[PDB]
Amino acid sequence: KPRVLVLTGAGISAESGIRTFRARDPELVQAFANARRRQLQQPEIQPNAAHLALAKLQDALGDRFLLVTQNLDNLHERAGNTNVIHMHGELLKVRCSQSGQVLDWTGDVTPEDKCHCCQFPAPLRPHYVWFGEMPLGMDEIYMALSMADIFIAIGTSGHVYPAAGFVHEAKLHGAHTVELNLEPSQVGNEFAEKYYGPASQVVPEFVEKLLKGLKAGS
């Protein structure tokens, strides 16, 4: 059946209580990053109906589905999605400054913390991508875009590149394009189909619509 590529942004995690990360000084930056990592470990923070509907969608489509997120949180994973591409990295990971190896990390990061991949342990760096830095997984993403039959952007502002250009890439390759957002994005007019409203309402409704049209469950 059709190949589906989903791009998500901060809007989909808003109803779960996750705010935009940093809308500089290393110590303050580390404090904020550490507070956001900590937030993700609170029992009260959970995936919402929009996250859960995307897991249902991957269950129905198997390898014909790919989820790409700008988000640093792990709510897609917790909802049940697998092989989620974090194009801006993750808060619950760090990277060895020397080897570049990525490690799971749940607690605070401090300058005292070191890698366990190198002969002599090296400092740890954020795994998230900041403005000016190069996004992750781009070869895989553009390959997926070139093969997608439907491209769905959810909770994205249209302000942040390269992610905001994906809808244009989808169009060039002949994908149907769908925007699901609280309000119109900066590139809302570039989408062929669009629904607006809270993600926890809009996303499950669309996913049902799509699954039924695909004759692939509910």
Binding site: V129, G132, M134, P135, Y142, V160, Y161, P162, E169, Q186
Partner: peptide, 8 residues
Amino acid sequence: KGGAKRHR
């Protein structure tokens, strides 16, 4: 396409 993470 591609390029660094950047605001509009």
